[PDB]
Amino acid sequence: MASMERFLSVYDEVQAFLLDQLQSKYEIDPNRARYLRIMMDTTCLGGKYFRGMTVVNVAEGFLAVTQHDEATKERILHDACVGGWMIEFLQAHYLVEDDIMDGSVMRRGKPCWYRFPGVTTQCAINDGIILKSWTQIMAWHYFADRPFLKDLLCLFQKVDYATAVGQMYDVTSMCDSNKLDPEVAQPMTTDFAEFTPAIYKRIVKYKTTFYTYLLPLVMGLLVSEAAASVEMNLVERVAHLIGEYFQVQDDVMDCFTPPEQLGKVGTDIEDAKCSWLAVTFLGKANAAQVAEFKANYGEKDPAKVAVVKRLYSKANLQADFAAYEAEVVREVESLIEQLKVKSPTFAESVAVVWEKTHKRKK
């Protein structure tokens, strides 16, 4: 177990705690409390909950093989649920600001938060900042007396920082590094020389993999008091690997999955992003295809966007994706086997996370 039901139930508790505290300590009025309730629901719910449920499933794995009083088992499961919501609220923060930064129109099948009629960008920027503050309010309330509090806060903040650095790498990925200058308007690259696997990998490593895979796996270990029982270098390597594959999927779906299924409308082509599709197309294309790509990439013009998507389709990128995927399967399986040496239970949790990631269709 009922993991998803327990996790969703704890959302109601955290929300009530936060909103009750706003009334009792922060002098909030009922209508602004309602606004923040709706904001919380809209930005924190309706996703796949993969990050939060990873914390829960890692914790459940150790519960199955560790001797505990039932009260202790309930405490660990509750801590796992609260920690998972910390990551889901961190996600909510990033998506609110990212949708503004990327000029997006839909998220989770609804308008992006900033596009809601009674929201607008000026309030949505601050709403996003509130979401991140709530992660810390949660931590200090629910975990005040826990032995893992310091480790958890330190990990959370380093992951949050890495993600913000990665967002800088992402939103500057269509500029030439040598021309970056706050004082000079930034032209889009014309040579696309920095659309390389290594540079792509750096964006993804920081913007996605720490908070989507490393943070939930290690938080599950922390609330289980089990971190010392795994090889942390393997956790870092497998989180980076699965997290990169997760983003490659997201890049592919941005272009080729209908918004009806995906729940968002892709902007990577029009935004000139350094996506897996663009890097891989450039790793394959002949001279004429590169020049045609350059003539059309990074423009909102729906007909130029359409030229790019046809170039992608005719370049048979499904072949590159399959070879990349087959390589990731080898390496993920190898790392899971290595994890089994010290931590069979955690290895299985990583196998579950991989299976969920590998099979996802949104």
Ligand X SMILES: C=C(C)CCOP(=O)(O)OP(=O)(O)O
| Residues forming the site for ligand X (CB under 6 A) | 47-48, 50, 91, 94-95, 98, 102, 104, 108, 163, 167, 207-208, 212, 247, 250, 254, 264
Residue 191 is a binding residue for a second copy (CB under 8 A): no
Give the residue from 57, 348, 36, 361 showing the smallest Cα distance to 224: 57
DSSP string, 300-328: --HHHHHHHHHHHHHTTHHHHHHHHHHHH
- Helix H, strand E, coil C: the string for 245-268 is HHHHHHHHHHHHCCHHHHCCCCCC
Q: Per the structure block, which two tokens stand in for 311?
A: 């170039």
Q: Which stretch binds a second copy (CB under 8 A): 38-46, 249-257, 289-297, 354-362?
A: 38-46
Q: Per the structure block, which two tokens stand in for 293?
A: 């790509």
Residue 171 is a binding residue for a second copy (CB under 8 A): yes
User: Which positions from 70 through 99 interact with a second copy, judged by CB under 8 A?
Assistant: 97
Distance CA 162, CA 143 (A): 23
Strands (E), 41-140: 106-107, 110-111
69 is in an annotated binding site: no
Reading phi first (left if > 0) and then psi (alpha if -120 to 50, else beta), residue 274 is in: beta
Identity of residue 263: G
181 is in an annotated binding site: no
Q: Which is nearer to a second copy, 213 or 346 (CB)?
A: 213
Q: Which is nearer to a second copy, 167 or 189 (CB)?
A: 167
Dihedral pair phi/psi, residue 110, rounded to 5°: -125, 170
29 is in an annotated binding site: no
Residue number of the CB closest to ligand X reads: 47
Q: How far is the CB of 177 from a second copy (least distance, A)?
A: 5
The single residue among 5, 12, 181, 260 that binds a second copy, judged by CB under 8 A, is: 181
98 is in an annotated binding site: yes
Q: Which residues contact 358 (CB under 8 A, 6 or more apart)?
A: 245, 329
Q: Which residues contact 201 (CB under 8 A, 6 or more apart)?
A: 244
Q: Which does 47 bind (CB under 5 to 8 A by kind): ligand X, a second copy, Mn ion, none?
A: ligand X
Q: Which is nearer to ligand X, 102 or 226 (CB)?
A: 102
102 is in an annotated binding site: yes
Binding mask 198-227 for a second copy (x = CB under 8 A): ----x--xx---------------------
The single residue among 79, 88, 160, 250 that binds Mn ion, judged by CB under 5 A, is: 250
Distance CA 92, CA 94 (A): 6
What are the angstrom distances between the C-alpha of 237 and each of 98, 115, 232, 240? 26, 38, 9, 5
Q: Which is nearer to ligand X, 167 or 343 (CB)?
A: 167
271 is in an annotated binding site: no
Torsion 255-259-260-261 (CA) sign: positive
Q: Which is nearer to a second copy, 4 or 180 (CB)?
A: 180
Residues annotated in a binding site for Zn(2+): 98, 102, 170, 236, 250, 254, 268
Binding site for a second copy (CB under 8 A): 22, 26-29, 31-32, 34-36, 38-39, 42, 97, 100-102, 116-120, 122-123, 125-127, 129-130, 133-134, 136-137, 140, 149-150, 153-154, 157-158, 160-162, 164-165, 167-169, 171-172, 177-186, 202, 205-206
Residues annotated in a binding site for Mn(2+): 98, 102, 170, 250, 254
